[PDB]
Design a protein around this ligand. Structure first.
Ligand code: CHL
Ligand code: CHL
Ligand code: CHL
Ligand code: CLA
Ligand code: CLA
Ligand code: CLA
Ligand code: CLA
Ligand SMILES: CC1=C[C@H](O)CC(C)(C)[C@H]1/C=C/C(C)=C/C=C/C(C)=C/C=C/C=C(C)/C=C/C=C(C)/C=C/C1=C(C)C[C@H](O)CC1(C)C
Ligand SMILES: CC1=C[C@H](O)CC(C)(C)[C@H]1/C=C/C(C)=C/C=C/C(C)=C/C=C/C=C(C)/C=C/C=C(C)/C=C/C1=C(C)C[C@H](O)CC1(C)C
Ligand SMILES: CC1=C[C@H](O)CC(C)(C)[C@H]1/C=C/C(C)=C/C=C/C(C)=C/C=C/C=C(C)/C=C/C=C(C)/C=C/C1=C(C)C[C@H](O)CC1(C)C
Ligand SMILES: CC1=C[C@H](O)CC(C)(C)[C@H]1/C=C/C(C)=C/C=C/C(C)=C/C=C/C=C(C)/C=C/C=C(C)/C=C/C1=C(C)C[C@H](O)CC1(C)C
Lengths: 220, 232, 220
């Protein structure tokens, strides 16, 4: 009996959410569980800007979640990675052979981080400005769901499929954002990769959990 | 030499930083700015991608915060650069670098202005703090609510005794100097954020950071301190 | 003294006639006219922020009392394996676990995982009931429900209600300020609040915060 829209949509506190919802959180936008306890989206325009921020953070966090897990899964699958862990995958530029992509010394073989950053900043500024106001791939489209070249497969030509895939997108993205915050905090706390953290939690679940690192940041 | 004719014919041929045809923060990639950033206020490049100032009164309070932070940050940039700059010339400060100059009050001979014992010669920390909080509260409440140097003046650009040389009598020059102020101040705020960050990661003075950079720019950049905050 | 209306006490005292926003009517408790950042221009964001303020206030009052009590009782003579508040959580990893008042047969908690499970389940239950009601209260105020939360009945008169509201929010702002102080000066000092007061009373001009001022300098 699931809706994901309208007044009787799924909400953030489940059955205890009928008086927990602001009047402006109409069941119009994907992922609207009624979670605005802080009232930060009371203005529809601030609400629109926050929805854009949420969706872009969601997509970037999904790409980043896949990019953190994949090298470690492949390194535990056997391929050579000079530094497989994600929070030192950036320090491969300062090694002797530079940042090899999949361990092959003749795939990319990057030696200078400043030129890497220059080409990244150039390309990224170009594409983010095109994302803002359009360009070669869409002069006048939606700021969030442009389509028309970002749908080479054509999944969302029906409004109902469009809506349900919107909800799926934003929810996989909230999941990935939560998991990326976890990556950050537990890399700082543990100092090991996410896959190795799961391996250690499966080794000894009652022992090697986050509480084993609880007295780590005490001033003393 | 010719006499320049009045602005009845020329009300706004110089309004380059205001109005709808104003520079924006992404140039031609900005599209059109939000409906509330219409180009009446200085430094309006249409940057509200978070919508935090969608309400007009919150936008006013944020303009106040931004301009006061900008002035304080300009003073702070000049005050962190000047003592170190003159300490590279032979003026014997206790600690010319800014994030160590506060502890000069714990020296043997106290905090000497320009490293001169016959100058201020402060020996206590909490007399400094008490005097400072007294006078700063007085003048910040004055900035808030009138005072000896102006009562019914503007909140951000009061003038009067704060425009002694009269550089804001011309409204065109005033509208241009406001943009100059806010831009120099945003630059100084960015540069004070840089001061903080590249003091934390480096621990040297900013002018010494520049000396190190121009010693070998390909080596002495911020990526040389990228692995310092690694977990364990 | 009024605490309400246009000529209420304000946060800059005599300096405060021209700074107050037009939306900060003297209607709500603790309204000293302090919105320099304009974060509560919208009445709905203002309501959500008032709820956040009052809940943070009550939680900070309970926490202030919970950090002061065990140390007082600790020098008062009572054994406290770890009396200091910012390591009172690490008692679970001791040999005898977390014993409440030093008695081995009061609580004797050995598992932090089950403690946290307990806590999450009924904190979620209670906070959802706080949001939208439940066994104590349906349709009451989100902030001052009363009924079952006034077994003594202090606030049946509107004037007593208003003055106790102001007293509540001000003791709560005091406790929030003191809790921020607890946090920052535990990180800076590494000792308890009561021991910090003892050291400040032992030597007020030497043992103050400025003695720990050069502690966080980078020096590299
Ligand atoms: C009726 C039971 C029920 C309860 C109690 C909750 C509770 C929650 N849901 Mg919800 N849900 C419930 C039913 C349902 N939810 C959902 C669907 C969702 C979604 C999609 C989401 C939620 C989210 C949330 C959270 C929002 C509030 C928050 O941020 O916590 C704030 C309070 C805490 C985080 C306290 C944590 C407890 C713990 C004691 C903290 C530990 C303390 C540390 C040791 C201190 C830190 C130390 C420092 C110094 C380093 C909250 C945990 C959101 C979420 O995941 O946010 C996290 C969210 O995105 N729910 C559905 C499907 C329709 C439900 C159906 O019944
Ligand atoms: C009575 C003594 C009095 C003193 C010592 C100051 C001193 C100061 N005011 Mg100030 N004010 C004083 C009264 C008043 N102020 C203001 C309104 C302001 C504003 C709006 C600002 C200051 C700022 C400043 C600072 C920069 C000085 C400056 O503007 O140079 C300019 C002239 C050089 C010759 C400085 C701390 C600025 C600041 O704090 O930013 C760093 C700032 O933006 N004041 C009003 C209301 C009209 C006052 C009324 O009495
Ligand atoms: C007329 C004199 C008068 C002055 C100057 C003030 C000033 C203040 N009152 Mg107010 N009051 C005054 C009269 C009255 N007040 C009140 C009732 C209240 C209340 C209930 C409250 C205030 C608060 C405040 C503060 C709000 C502004 C702020 O947040 O500071 C911002 C500026 C600072 C904090 C500067 C601090 C100075 C110091 C130099 C900082 C040290 C620098 C560090 C070394 C740098 C840090 C290093 C880093 C890197 C770690 C401010 C200190 C609020 C408060 O307590 O907030 C804190 C508050 O809740 N007042 C009453 C009763 C009606 C008054 C009657 O006359
Ligand atoms: C769904 C995402 C997700 C997943 C699968 C994991 C999984 C894991 N985390 Mg990570 N973590 C996450 C989110 C996640 N975390 C987030 C959002 C944060 C920030 C608060 C952290 C912060 C964090 C730290 C600091 C540490 C871990 C650690 C761990 C491992 C041990 C489990 C533990 O200590 O729990 C800790 C979990 C949290 C602190 C918060 C996550 C909240 C979960 C998803 C909801 C509760 C689900 C749970 C099964 C039901 C309640 C259990 C009950 C006892 C309360 C395990 C591999 C530890 C590790 O490396 O061990 C090897 C460790 O040191 N995590
Ligand atoms: C936000 C503004 C700001 C702040 C907070 C500071 C703070 C500080 N400065 Mg800096 N400074 C600033 C702006 C600032 N400065 C700017 C804009 C300049 C350029 C003109 C300087 C130039 C400067 C020098 C050259 C020196 C300082 C010094 C100092 C320290 C002692 C302050 C003192 O003795 O004042 C009280 C003194 C006066 C108000 C004036 C002098 C008193 C005369 C002699 C008598 C007048 C009667 C202190 C850390 C001193 C220091 O220790 O350097 C590390 C020092 O020698 N400052
Ligand atoms: C306009 C302000 C300004 C200026 C002039 C400088 C200047 C400098 N900084 Mg500082 N910095 C700034 C802002 C500024 N920074 C800000 C806002 C931050 C916080 C993000 C930092 C954080 C920072 C760190 C952590 C470090 C420096 C360092 C340096 C020095 C080496 C340059 C470097 O490593 O770049 C690093 C630059 C950044 C991290 C961000 C600033 C970006 C600039 C201002 C905009 C782009 C302009 C630039 C020329 C183009 C770069 C793109 C290029 C790849 C094509 C140099 C003296 C390093 C140093 O001391 O070396 C000896 C160092 O360790 N800075
Ligand atoms: C009302 C609440 C309260 C109380 C009673 C105390 C009391 C104390 N604090 Mg704590 N503190 C507080 C709030 C409070 N603090 C807050 C809000 C912060 C965060 C900014 C701190 C941060 C802090 C640190 C980092 C340290 C202390 C320390 C201390 C002790 C020495 C005093 C000192 O160095 O002052 C420092 C006070 C502050 C930094 C801010 C508090 C602002 C007060 C309440 C307002 C000014 C009142 C004052 C009497 C009048 C002005 C004095 C004039 C010289 C300017 C003393 C037991 C030191 C300690 O442990 O010594 C044993 C220490 O290292 N405190
Ligand atoms: C809703 C609500 C409600 C109420 O009202 C209020 C409040 C509470 C406020 C709210 C909440 C909010 C929240 C919670 C938020 C969160 C966020 C996040 C987490 C994000 C992330 C986010 C995240 C993200 C982006 C991520 C990203 C990622 C990436 C890029 C990655 C990258 C990378 C990788 C691959 C790895 C390698 O080696 C390198 C690098 C380079 C590193
Ligand atoms: C626009 C926008 C838009 C969208 O919508 C959203 C967003 C993005 C959010 C936004 C952004 C924002 C930003 C970026 C901000 C920033 C800020 C800063 C940086 C500040 C600084 C700021 C800064 C500042 C004040 C500074 C100041 C300074 C000072 C006082 C100084 C002092 C001093 C000195 C002299 C030195 C000595 O020896 C000591 C001391 C004592 C230390
Ligand atoms: C009102 C009035 C009135 C009457 O009528 C007239 C008069 C008297 C004239 C007036 C007054 C005025 C004034 C006082 C002014 C001031 C200004 C300033 C201080 C600025 C700054 C300004 C400032 C600024 C821009 C700043 C900037 C900064 C920067 C770039 C930085 C860079 C850097 C860094 C980061 C670090 C590294 O490693 C190095 C370097 C490379 C060094
Ligand atoms: C008004 C205004 C105005 C303008 O406009 C803007 C601005 C400036 C933004 C604003 C301001 C604001 C502020 C200042 C805020 C603050 C806050 C706080 C401080 C909080 C605390 C807060 C605090 C709190 C909650 C606290 C809590 C506590 C607790 C739970 C406790 C717990 C505990 C204890 C018992 C101890 C043991 O061992 C353990 C534990 C577990 C640890």
């Amino acid at each position: 009996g699931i809706e994901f829209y309208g007044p009787n949509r799924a909400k953030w506190l489940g059955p205890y959410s009928e008086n927990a919802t602001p009047a402006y959180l109409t069941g119009e936008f994907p992922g609207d569980y009624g979670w605005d306890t802080a009232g930060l989206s009371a203005d529809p325009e601030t609400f629109k800007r926050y929805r854009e921020l949420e969706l872009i953070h969601a997509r970037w966090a999904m790409l980043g979640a896949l990019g953190c897990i994949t090298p470690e899964l492949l390194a535990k699958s056997g391929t050579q990675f000079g530094e497989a862990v994600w929070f030192k995958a950036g320090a491969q530029i300062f090694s002797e052979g530079g940042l090899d992509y999949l361990g092959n010394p003749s795939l990319v073989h990057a030696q200078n981080i400043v030129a890497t950053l220059a080409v990244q900043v150039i390309l990224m500024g170009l594409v983010e400005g095109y994302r803002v106001n359009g360009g070669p791939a869409g002069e006048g489209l939606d700021p969030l769901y442009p389509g028309e070249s970002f749908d080479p497969l054509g999944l969302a030509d029906d409004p109902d499929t469009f809506a349900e895939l919107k909800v799926k997108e934003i929810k996989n993205g909230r999941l990935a954002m939560f998991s990326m915050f976890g990556f950050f905090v537990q890399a700082i706390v543990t100092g090991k990769g996410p896959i190795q953290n799961l391996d250690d939690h499966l080794s000894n679940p009652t022992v090697n959990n986050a509480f084993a690192f609880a007295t780590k940041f005490t001033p003393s | 030499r010719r006499t320049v004719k009045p602005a009845s014919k020329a009300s706004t041929p110089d309004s380059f930083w205001y109005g709808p045809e104003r520079p924006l923060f992404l140039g031609a990639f900005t599209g059109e700015p939000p409906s509330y950033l219409t180009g009446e206020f200085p430094g309006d490049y249409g940057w509200d991608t978070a919508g935090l100032s969608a309400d007009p009164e919150t936008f006013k309070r944020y303009r106040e915060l931004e301009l006061i932070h900008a002035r304080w940050a300009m003073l702070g940039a000049l005050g962190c650069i000047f003592p170190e700059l003159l300490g590279s010339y032979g003026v014997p400060f206790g600690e010319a670098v800014w994030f160590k100059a506060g502890a000069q009050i714990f020296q043997e001979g106290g905090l000497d202005y320009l490293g001169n014992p016959n100058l201020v010669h402060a020996q206590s920390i909490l007399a400094i703090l008490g005097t400072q909080v007294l006078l700063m509260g007085a003048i910040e409440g004055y900035r808030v609510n009138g005072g000896p140097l102006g009562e019914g003046l503007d909140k951000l650009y009061p003038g009067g005794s704060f425009d002694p040389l009269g550089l804001a009598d011309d409204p065109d020059t005033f509208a241009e100097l406001k943009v100059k102020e806010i831009k120099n101040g945003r630059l100084a705020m960015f540069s004070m954020f840089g001061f903080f960050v590249q003091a934390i990661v480096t621990g040297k003075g900013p002018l010494q950071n520049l000396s190190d950079h121009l010693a070998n720019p390909g080596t002495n950049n911020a990526f040389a301190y990228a692995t310092k905050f690694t977990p364990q | 003294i009024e605490w309400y209306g246009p000529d209420r006490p304000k946060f800059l005292g005599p300096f405060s006639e021209g700074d107050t926003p037009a939306y900060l009517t003297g209607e709500f408790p603790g309204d000293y006219g302090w919105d320099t950042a304009g974060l509560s221009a919208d009445p709905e964001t203002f309501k959500r922020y008032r709820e956040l303020e009052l809940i943070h206030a009550r939680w900070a009052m309970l926490g202030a009392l919970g950090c002061i009590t065990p140390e007082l009782l600790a020098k008062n003579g009572i054994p406290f394996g770890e009396a200091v508040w910012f390591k009172a959580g690490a008692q679970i990893f001791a040999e005898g676990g977390l014993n409440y008042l030093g008695n081995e047969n009061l609580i004797h908690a050995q598992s932090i995982i089950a403690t946290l499970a307990f806590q999450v389940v009924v904190m979620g239950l209670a906070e959802a009931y706080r949001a939208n009601g439940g066994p104590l209260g349906e349709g009451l105020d989100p902030l001052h429900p009363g009924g079952a939360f006034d077994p003594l009945g202090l606030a049946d008169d509107p004037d007593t209600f208003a003055e106790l509201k102001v007293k509540e929010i001000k003791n709560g702002r005091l406790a929030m300020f003191s809790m921020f102080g607890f946090f920052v000066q535990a990180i800076v000092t590494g000792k308890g609040p009561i021991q910090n007061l003892d050291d400040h009373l032992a030597n007020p001009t030497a043992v103050n915060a400025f003695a720990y001022a050069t502690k966080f300098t980078p020096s590299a």
